[PDB]
Amino acid sequence: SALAQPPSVSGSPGQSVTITCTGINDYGAAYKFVSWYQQHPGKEPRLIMKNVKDRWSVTPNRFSGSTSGNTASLTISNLQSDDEAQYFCAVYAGGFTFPRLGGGTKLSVL
Amino acid sequence: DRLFQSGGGVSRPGGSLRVNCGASGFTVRTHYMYWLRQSPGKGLEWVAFMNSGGSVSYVDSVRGRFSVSRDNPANAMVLQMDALKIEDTGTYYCARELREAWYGDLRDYSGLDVWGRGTIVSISS
Amino acid sequence: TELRDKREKKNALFYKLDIVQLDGNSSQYRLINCNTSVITQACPKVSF
Ligand SMILES: *[C@@H]1O[C@H](CO)[C@@H](O[C@@H]2O[C@H](CO)[C@@H](O[C@@H]3O[C@H](CO[C@H]4O[C@H](CO[C@H]5O[C@H](CO)[C@@H](O)[C@H](O)[C@@H]5O)[C@@H](O)[C@H](O)[C@@H]4O)[C@@H](O)[C@H](O[C@H]4O[C@H](CO)[C@@H](O)[C@H](O[C@H]5O[C@H](CO)[C@@H](O)[C@H](O)[C@@H]5O)[C@@H]4O)[C@@H]3O)[C@H](O)[C@H]2NC(C)=O)[C@H](O)[C@H]1NC(C)=O
Ligand SMILES: *[C@@H]1O[C@H](CO)[C@@H](O)[C@H](O)[C@H]1NC(C)=O
């Protein structure tokens, strides 16, 4: 089935919030590659993070990753208007046919 | 690298449509490719996958109805869709994935790095 | 080795690209191919 994301999160500008990603160890013990995706409204997905804490190309420092075995956490600090977007957690492992995709969470800045 | 899409459009239930996905900077025929769809206001969902070897896996909900084929002269893939249903309405995406499978066996995985802008498909009566 | 009761702790070096991280704690590692296939050493007289 699908990973668990809370539908929506909210926070004040400049602060930090975390989006959680639960159920990672539901299917097998294979090493869980954890990925994160940003999508602005009307835009396509853009890859944010791989390997729970590994930043990708142009992603600033404000994005960080952590993990608790079955729950991953993507934290964003110094909240700003650009960050308002839809986020998707995903996990892949060897033998998978498709990587498991989260339900997505809308992040809004107050 | 870039991907560019065309096709899609309007169809009655049971009709047929077709979407092209062409690449630049690299050839489709030697990479891992994915077809996904997203219904309006909803989340992404898998549709089809073609490996570097060219064998294709379909999700059950479209097996027997959707078919992907390589267009090597155009350096593209084609999603042909027949027996269209209402549920098939949404925006479709063709995407490229980068992985590392050394001597067959895998060790490293990036994810989906290249994403087409998507084509709109509307099945209506 | 070799009395099948006296096991010993040994160590050696393997080029990184031949090692995979085990499906669990990052301190644990596995040979690249061993859940999947049989691995054989090449014999010195048979170097082709
Ligand atoms: C063997 O050795 C060779 C040589 O070392 C290795 O090749 C290297 O491989 C790297 C991995 O791909 C290459 O890095 C990529 O570079 C491209 C851009 O390269 C061009 O531009 C460089 C300069 O860019 C800067 O400056 C320009 C202005 O001049 C500025 O606009 C840029 O923003 C940037 O600041 C040149 O120096 C270079 O020669 C070349 O002309 C870069 O775009 C790649 O990032 C990609 O990131 C993800 C995937 O990680 C991808 O999705 C991105 O696309 C997304 O974003 C773009 C917009 O940016 C959008 O169009 C897409 O639709 C997506 O939304 C993006 O493509 C990546 O950083 C490196 O260039 C290359 N080296 C050489 C000399 O070619 C090779 O890997 C080695 N192999 C092995 C096995 O060892
Ligand atoms: C070993 O496994 C435990 C179980 O969760 C974990 O807390 C610990 O961080 C692991 N150690 C390493 C080095 O991964």
Ligand 2 atom 12, closest CA: C25
**Tokens at residue A16, please?**
């930090």
CA A59 – ligand 1 centroid, Å: 15
What is the length of chain C? 48
Strand B66-71 relative to strand B90-102, pairing: unpaired
Report the C-alpha gap between B40 and A89 in whole angstroms. Answer: 19
Technique used:
cryo-EM
- Closest C-alpha among B12, B20, B7 to residue B89: B12
| Ligand 1 neighbourhood includes B114 CB (under 6 angstroms) | yes
For residue C3, give every residue at least 6 positions away whose Cβ sits within 8 Å of its Cβ, in sequence order, or none: none
Query: Does ligand 1 come within 6 angstroms of the Cβ of B113?
Result: yes
Report helix, strand or coil for B100: strand
Rounded Cα–Cα distance for residues A42 and A102 (Å)? 19
Q: What are phi and psi of A26, to 5 degrees?
A: -75, -30
- Spell out where chain B has E strands: 2-7, 9-11, 16-24, 32-38, 44-50, 56-58, 66-71, 76-82, 90-102, 105-115, 119-123
Are B49 and B57 in contact by the 8 Å Cβ rule? The answer is yes
Half-sphere exposure of A89 (CA within 13 A, CB side): 30
3-state class of B51 per DSSP? coil
Q: Which two tokens stand for residue B96?
A: 């490229």
From residue A54, alpha-carbon distances to A67, B64, B79, B83 in Å are 12, 40, 34, 43
| Spatial separation of the C-alpha atoms in residues A25 and A79, rounded to whole Å | 30
Report B:27-56 residues touching A (Cβ under 8 A).
43-46, 49
Rounded Cα distance, B39 and A15, in Å: 33
Residue B122, SS3? strand
Q: Strand A105-109 relative to strand A8-11: parallel, antiparallel, unpaired?
A: parallel
User: CA B57, CA B55: separation in Å to the nearest integer?
Assistant: 7
Residues 6 or more apart whose CB falls under 8 angstroms from that of A63 comprise A48, A49, A55, A74, A75, A76
Cβ contact B2:B117 at 8 Å:
no
Residues 6 or more apart whose CB falls under 8 angstroms from that of B26 comprise B1, B96
Compute the distance between CA of residue A37 and CA of residue A83 in angstroms, rounded to an integer. Answer: 12
- CA dist A27 and A14 (Å) reads 37
Give the resolution to one decimal, in Å.
4.9
Give which of A40, A50, A52, A106 to mutate to test B binding, by max B Cβ within 10 Å.
A50
Residue nearest to atom 8 of ligand 2 (CA): C25
How far is A88 from A105, CA to CA, in rounded Å?
7
Flag whether residue C17 sits within 8 Å of chain B, measured between CB atoms: yes
Q: Among C21, C22, C23, C25, which is best to mutate for testing ligand 2, by the most ligand atoms less than 8 A from CB?
A: C25
Contact call for residues A70 and A25 (beta carbons, < 8 A): yes
Q: Identify the bridge partners of residue B68 per DSSP, sorted by sequence position.
A: B79
Which residue of chain C comes nearest to B107, CA vs CA? C20
A21 vs chain C: nearest CA distance in angstroms?
18
The answer to whether the beta carbons of residues B104 and B51 sit under 8 Å apart is no
Residue in the structure block whose two tokens are 């090449």: C42
Going by their DSSP bridges, the two strands B32-38 and B44-50 should be labelled as antiparallel
The alpha carbon of residue C18 is apart from the nearest alpha carbon of chain A, in Å, by 17
Cβ atoms < 10 Å from Cβ of B123: 19
Dihedral sign, Cα of residue B52, residue B25, residue B36, residue A71:
positive
What is the distance, to the nearest Å, from the Cα of residue B53 to the centroid of all Cα atoms in its chain?
16
Owner of token pair 């309405």 = B89
C25 CA to centre of ligand 1 in angstroms = 33
Tokens at residue A18, please?
Answer: 């975390």
Three-class SS state of B61? helix
Q: Tell me the sheet residues that pair with B19.
A: B7, B79
Q: What is the CA radius of gyration of chain A?
A: 13
